[PDB]
Symmetry: C6
Subunit: 123 residues, 6 copies
């Protein structure tokens, strides 16, 4: 499998992605209710581009974008995760000579809404 990130017309080779949602439960089961969603964590090959660092610097800037998972063999876009109005919250560029893709960017954005396959979570 192979995926990509798309922001501001710029595409980033994505090493790792994750996004999670959760509601608390009371006692056993007994969902407390209320839900948290919209935080997405990405790791990117840093390239020579500086654009992701500037977004972190910019702060209040909110953007839209999509995470597209492509089937390993086949070109066509098995699934795409779209986020709207996401703010840069944390950022870290790390170089490790020790292995593999030494220079990577790892950051977390907080989106107003994420959506996928007709599923929606808005804050």
């Amino acid at each position: 499998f192979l995926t990509s990130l798309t922001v501001a017309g710029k595409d980033y080779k994505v090493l790792n992605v994750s996004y999670d949602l959760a509601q608390e439960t009371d006692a056993s089961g007994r969902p407390s209710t209320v839900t948290r969603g919209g935080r997405i964590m990405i790791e990117v090959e840093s390239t020579g581009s500086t654009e992701l660092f500037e977004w972190m610097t910019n702060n209040f800037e909110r953007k839209d974008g999509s995470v597209k998972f492509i089937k390993r063999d086949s070109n066509a876009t098995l699934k795409e995760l779209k986020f709207t109005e996401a703010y840069m919250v944390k950022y870290k560029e790390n170089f490790d000579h020790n292995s593999e893709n030494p220079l990577t960017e790892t950051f977390m954005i907080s989106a107003r809404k994420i959506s996928m396959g007709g599923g929606e979570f808005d804050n």
Copy 2:
């Protein structure tokens, strides 16, 4: 060994499952009593389907389903774990290019009751 998850007539290849129950003890032994049960943790190959994400989005929706463990060599269903009226509590879709099954879904449901081989735990 190989297992599967069955929900809403949809079958998911299951990488990891677990479900645990516990009662507290007082001093040594001296079970405090009261028991917790019904939480099940599953990890699934994500496919192109989006159905599990929507359930998390849906929130209050409760479902039934079964986890069926099939003997490695043989087709027939060594054991099946059935849950009734389970609510989506936590969900996380994670992509890791690093190894093996890169795209997986890891979630936890809280069932009103689980049952297996005549054994029962209801909340």
Copy 3:
């Protein structure tokens, strides 16, 4: 080395066992005294049997049994740990496709007394 668990006339291939006892010390040495013992942790190949799950469900049921360590080469029973009046306290059945014995049961019982080679600890 190879060991087995014996409960209710049923024998379980045991992957891991442990049982520990401890008394607190005051300052350096200066045993506080009072002792804790009787908790035993076991991991079992799950088979198609459901019996251990039902015991956890049953709760208050106390049983007797023995853990028998057999010398690797030789049939004869190097040592046997016997417990009396043990209550099911925690239980977890876990499936991991990742390696080795994928389907295992891991549980902890709290015994009124354990004994071995003339040694005794009763609560």
Copy 4:
């Protein structure tokens, strides 16, 4: 990929670098705002030079410098991170015979400002 550190006209072979910025969020998203930036963590082959130890000793001394990431194959400077008025905050020289580059220096500096590709963070 290969990088270097430049301080006081002295160049250090850099094994690991990292620098991170973060702002807190309130509830979900809801950035608390306020931001932290300017801390950089570096690991260096110790050589026979003692200069980095003296800076830690010196304490209040602030310096400028740059971290330059060079493309693996090619000489030219894919990206450079520049910091101004950075103070030595933590330092540790560690020798481990166990593997690889046994003698390394690991330290963290706190810069008044970092900048890269037109992006800026000042305190």
Copy 5:
């Protein structure tokens, strides 16, 4: 290197040993003073013997003994650690089929005094 434990005329093949002493410091250096010593941690191949379990059961019983480190090649006793009036404080017999020496005993004794090469620590 190879070592052994000697208690009650019984010798135990020892896999791991450790014993540590410490005094607290105030601010930087500035030893707070007061010292802790005399606790020894050992891991033993369990054999068919039950003697170590009974000592834990016995509780208040204090014993003497020695830990003797023998040079790998040569018979003669490079160093020996002797303890006097040690009380059984913690004990755990653990079986792990996963590797190496599956059946081991891991316990900690609290000695009134340890001594080695003319060095002494008494409580």
Copy 6:
């Protein structure tokens, strides 16, 4: 690379060394100031010597010494760390049959002053 410890005219083959200094920062950067230094952690092949254990026993005894890092290929002393008036604070002799250098001594001394290449930190 290879290093050695020198105390009381006795030389110890050193497996691991480390020494670190740090000052706290307020908010971002904003060094709180005040500094901690002088603690050195060493791991040594235990030999048949008992001298390091006695120093721990002795307690209040302060010593001087040096840690000398020798270039792997070449005899000459790439760098040497010298400490004056250091007190034995923690000590642990550990035997592990599992690998490599089974019998080692790991201890931490607190020096009044450390110095290296004209750099100085005194308490």
